[PDB]
């Protein structure tokens, strides 16, 4: 069994820099690539004692790629994997989807083919992108189009960064998010949202870090992915695979948008004075003070939830804890679904990396749920996208690249149709 991870854009490959850091520090591999069998899902073995990750970093701007070529992990990554363009899409979805995308995605495809050929029991792909940019949005959707026509039956775990409601860095990002979701809708099988303001609030309150940079954000994202692949990498008392989430969490082929959370995100000092058990982390995974997307599931209704458990966890209390959640009335599940949970326990605790701000915790929970509060975020995006589109601001850049007015209106009504779809399943 193998899974390969592709990274597109500035935010994508930065996230990868934290993930592969965490991976080698977990499996005891130095950054040069040699040990001083469970690593087979992510690293292929040269046979000379060197381990190479199954990943391809690609983007349109060579700046963020070439610090990676000269960091500590210069020798871990195979050179061909770290694809790099010559000029940026520059926060322009059309420029990444038709002008510059059309030259770079074909090189990525004939690369990713031999990664899959080296694999035997490929479980799927998992993609990392931020929709606010042009690279991660434009050629990301283009790459997903060509991936669906190539494989189809294989899972494509989309861990996307949506633009925050209020905290934003770009100004044309409403255009980019709407047009990108229009294709991310019918290509990604399972798409997980990761906002930025929510992670900002977690590091401010939980980690009690008052001055966080992007490093800490990417660090905890890797922690969630590690908690999600431990079931694939290691044996537990009750394991799930990546094909399990395809069935157990998305009731309709167009409702695939999950709210992620993780617990406990605790600094080095609270852990010393605080107690860890299964019941309280089962609680802490549901409160909105620990969610990764600025929305409130208290406003929505749950379809189905998923629960990753790591460390010294027995199965009797995960059942008792999820029972206590159902008997509470702050959160309610959809009428059509009497049972709304998918639980899982694995033996290996989360390892720590030196230099990170995550404590060594005895046990942890990674929750991945599906709800209807996600419908409020998409609607919130439509108000400010439609706000500017009527007066045709910033449209001239995209239409000058080779697009027209047609795709704005047709993409707009498609995501508008999705709004009505979410409201009718909730009833």
């Amino acid at each position: 069994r193998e899974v390969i991870s592709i990274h597109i854009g500035q935010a994508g490959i930065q996230v990868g820099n934290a993930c592969w850091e965490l991976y080698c520090l977990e499996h005891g591999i130095q950054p040069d690539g040699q040990m001083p069998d469970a690593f087979n899902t992510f690293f292929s073995e040269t046979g000379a004692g060197k381990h190479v990750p199954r990943c391809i970093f690609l983007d349109l701007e060579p700046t963020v790629v070439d610090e990676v070529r000269t960091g500590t992990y210069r020798q871990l990554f195979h050179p061909e994997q770290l694809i790099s363009g010559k000029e940026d899409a520059a926060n322009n979805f059309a420029r990444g989807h038709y002008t510059i995308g059309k030259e770079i995605v074909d090189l990525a495809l004939d690369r990713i083919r031999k990664l899959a050929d080296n694999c035997t029991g490929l479980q799927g792909f998992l993609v990392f992108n931020a929709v606010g940019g042009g690279t991660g949005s434009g050629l990301g959707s283009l790459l997903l189009e060509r991936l669906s026509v190539d494989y189809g039956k294989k899972s494509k775990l989309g861990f996307t960064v949506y633009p925050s409601p209020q905290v934003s860095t770009a100004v044309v990002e409403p255009y980019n998010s709407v047009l990108s979701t229009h294709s991310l809708l019918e290509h990604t099988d399972v798409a997980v949202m990761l906002d930025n303001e929510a992670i900002y609030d977690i590091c401010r309150r939980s980690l009690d870090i008052e001055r966080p940079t992007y490093t800490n954000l990417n660090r905890l994202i890797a922690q969630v992915i590690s908690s999600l692949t431990a079931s694939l990498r290691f044996d537990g008392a009750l394991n799930v695979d990546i094909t399990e989430f395809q069935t157990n969490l998305v009731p309709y082929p167009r409702i695939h948008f999950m709210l992620s959370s993780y617990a406990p995100i605790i600094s080095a000092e609270k852990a010393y004075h605080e107690q860890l058990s299964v019941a309280e982390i089962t609680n802490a995974a549901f409160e909105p003070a620990s969610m990764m997307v600025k929305c409130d599931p208290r406003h929505g209704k749950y379809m189905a939830c998923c629960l990753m458990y790591r460390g010294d966890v027995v199965p009797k209390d995960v059942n008792a804890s999820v029972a206590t959640i159902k008997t509470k009335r702050t959160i309610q599940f959809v009428d059509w679904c009497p049972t709304g949970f998918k639980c899982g326990i694995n033996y290996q605790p989360p390892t720590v990396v030196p230099g990170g701000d995550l404590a060594k915790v005895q046990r942890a929970v990674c929750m991945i749920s599906n709800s209807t509060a996600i419908g409020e975020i998409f609607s919130r995006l439509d108000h400010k996208f439609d706000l500017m589109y009527a007066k045709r601001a910033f449209v001239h850049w995209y239409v000058g690249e080779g697009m027209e007015e047609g795709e704005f209106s047709e993409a707009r009504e498609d995501l508008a149709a999705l709004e009505k779809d979410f409201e009718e399943v909730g009833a």
Binding site: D66, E87, A90, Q166, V171, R211, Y214, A393, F394
Partner: protein, 426 residues
Amino acid sequence: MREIVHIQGGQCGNQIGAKFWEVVSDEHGIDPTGTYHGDSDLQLERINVYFNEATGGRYVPRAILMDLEPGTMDSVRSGPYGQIFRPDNFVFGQTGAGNNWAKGHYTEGAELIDSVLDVVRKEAESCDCLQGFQVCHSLGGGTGSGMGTLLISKIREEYPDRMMLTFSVVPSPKVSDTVVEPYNATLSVHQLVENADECMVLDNEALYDICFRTLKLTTPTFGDLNHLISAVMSGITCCLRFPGQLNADLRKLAVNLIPFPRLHFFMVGFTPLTSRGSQQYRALTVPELTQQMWDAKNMMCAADPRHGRYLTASALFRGRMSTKEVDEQMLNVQNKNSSYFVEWIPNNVKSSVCDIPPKGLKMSATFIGNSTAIQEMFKRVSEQFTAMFRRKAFLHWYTGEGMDEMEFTEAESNMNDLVSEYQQYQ
């Protein structure tokens, strides 16, 4: 890979560019001889954007000096970092236009501009992937305005798909060095609105104001003004030369700040800029950079934005900073003073951070705001243009060279509808 060819025109362009090449070369650790003597390997990774290695550590700047009188060319080779320019890049006429836009655009331009074009072609094909061109000039003079603007038009019809920056100081009544300033400014702006991708408005009045209050200088010669302008130019293109947590290139800035193809006149400011008497009493955090950035008395134009409305704005930060702090400060200054911002565009501010500070400071910033208040300059200039042209003052020096009267009326109409069209989106 991403590359900027630099073009300096007229006397104003030559001094601005001279202090500019000293600042960049000192950032990359290249001594006046032109040989590498720096220490960090990071300084070598991104010298292809502005320089070419010649032989044995010799780095030559990718610049072209263009003028009409040899006083400026000799003043450049005399000063330090004067021996680094390639002598063939001193493309150069002999007669002189002399504050006559028609002489700068029709008589002497017609035989010098083929030469400057040929140098630019060699400099553009010598490199691989053009990011854009960078032109520094004035709008009052003749050899900078008319010739430089013709160069802009010729280049834009040659390479239409590349960006182009032009930094232009504009005349104002309080700093009135020549007498025909409006006749030059109005015709120059007419060509800039139809050719340049984006312009960065400057003026000498605001620069004098900055040197009085903020710098508290005793004797602000032109060296200090060129020093401020150079710091701005280095600050905006720092993203291509150094890596950072959130990189923002020139094209990324252009599409993020220009909502409509005719609205491309920006006012610029730079921080920190403090006197030596108060530089000791200061702190270096993000809020102190912002509330000195967004101050109206720090803009480098005499167009107070609170007399208008902000369309979009941008900040380019340099130094090891926390991106959360960057975004929350832009959020605070946009929520409090909500009236000063445009209403049908939320989150009017584009922001970026780079991880290399300039030498001598620990943390710096650079502000680029596209307000609608820039129309104060257009009305302020057009009335002086009208006041002479209703009565045909100084006209024969323009008329007897090839220009006729409908050129002035067309130029008047385009400037007048431009300030009208800024007012409508306001």
